[PDB]
Design a protein around this ligand. Structure first.
Ligand SMILES: CC(=O)N[C@H]1[C@H](O[C@@H]2[C@@H](O)[C@H](O)O[C@H](CO)[C@@H]2O)O[C@H](CO)[C@@H](O[C@@H]2O[C@H](CO)[C@H](O)[C@H](O)[C@H]2O)[C@@H]1O[C@@H]1O[C@@H](C)[C@@H](O)[C@@H](O)[C@@H]1O
Ligand SMILES: [Ca+2]
Ligand SMILES: [Ca+2]
Ligand SMILES: [Mg+2]
Length: 131
């Protein structure tokens, strides 16, 4: 028994995969579902620190499963859970600024940034480690 499928990274009971191509927010969600996963929904500060490193390391702008599409200002993860105040510190300073309507969150630099959902970016999928 191995926790994750080949090519997927194991971290604290969960499996992660970062794309090698760029897609918009909605397409990234579909990309993850197609591999039995979900555009990464962060559940803890530790997980955030882990994921942020992968983006700041490779110096890549990456999608996460978070948006305020349904209600401007109200950020919600793709699984329905609301963005806890515990995570506000992660937005880069000045973010989220919603310029030109930015309703999708990405890992950008050392923190998060809200950007155009239709912009193509890399994405990270997450799914629980095998039983
Ligand atoms: C207000 C705005 O549109 N911010 C842009 C910024 O735009 C300015 C204009 O406001 C000003 O009049 O002219 C200058 C050029 O002389 C400039 O166009 O332009 C920057 C650079 O393109 C842009 O930041 C970049 O945003 C992209 C988004 O994909 C990416 O994050 C990149 O790393 C940034 O450097 C500003 O965009 C906004 O601010 C960013 C900090 C971020 O919050 C973006 O989501 C915003 O759209
Ligand atoms: Ca917004
Ligand atoms: Ca922004
Ligand atoms: Mg909107």
């Amino acid at each position: 028994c191995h926790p994750c499928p080949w090519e997927w990274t194991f971290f604290q009971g969960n499996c992660y995969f970062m794309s090698n191509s760029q897609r918009n927010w909605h397409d990234s969600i579909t990309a993850c579902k197609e591999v039995g996963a979900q555009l990464v929904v962060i559940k803890s500060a530790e997980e955030q620190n882990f994921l942020q490193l992968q983006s700041s390391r490779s110096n890549r702008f990456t999608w996460m499963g978070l948006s305020d599409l349904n209600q401007e200002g109200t950020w919600q993860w793709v699984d329905g859970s609301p963005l806890l105040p515990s995570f506000k510190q992660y937005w880069n300073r000045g973010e989220p600024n919603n310029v030109g309507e930015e309703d999708c969150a990405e890992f950008s630099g050392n923190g998060w940034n809200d950007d155009k959902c239709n912009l193509a970016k890399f994405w990270i999928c997450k799914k629980s480690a095998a039983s």
